Structure 1
Amino acid sequence: MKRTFQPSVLKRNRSHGFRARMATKNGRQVLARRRAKGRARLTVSK
């Protein structure tokens, strides 16, 4: 049956992940702790 996922790029920004991270103290914090702390190749947006 409906397994909890259902992808949709557009629905992957302000609603979640993507570049929206650059709009909030914590949001932008995530990037630091993520990239810097333990260099991540990261990928977020595709």
Structure 2
Amino acid sequence: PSVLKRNRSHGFRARMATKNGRQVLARRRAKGRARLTVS
């Protein structure tokens, strides 16, 4: 794989673009994991 495609498919901005990305990020923040999506 490549870092470009990895970010475009599961990056912070890429996930945040979709509606469910906000819910996923909120769940992650509630969980408390240090890294949200990647890097």
TM-score interval w.r.t. the shorter chain?
0.5 to 0.7
Question: TM-score under structure 2 normalisation?
Answer: 0.54
Bigger Rg, structure 1 or 2: 1
Q: 5+ residue gaps in structure 2? A: none
More helix as a share of residues: 2
Question: TM-score under structure 1 normalisation?
Answer: 0.50
Aligned-pair identity in percent equals: 100
Superposed structure 1 runs of 4+ greater than 4 Å apart: none
Q: How many residues align?
A: 39
CA RMSD of aligned residues (A): 2.3
Larger relative contact order (CA 8 Å, sep ≥ 6): 2
Q: 5+ residue gaps in structure 1? A: 1-6
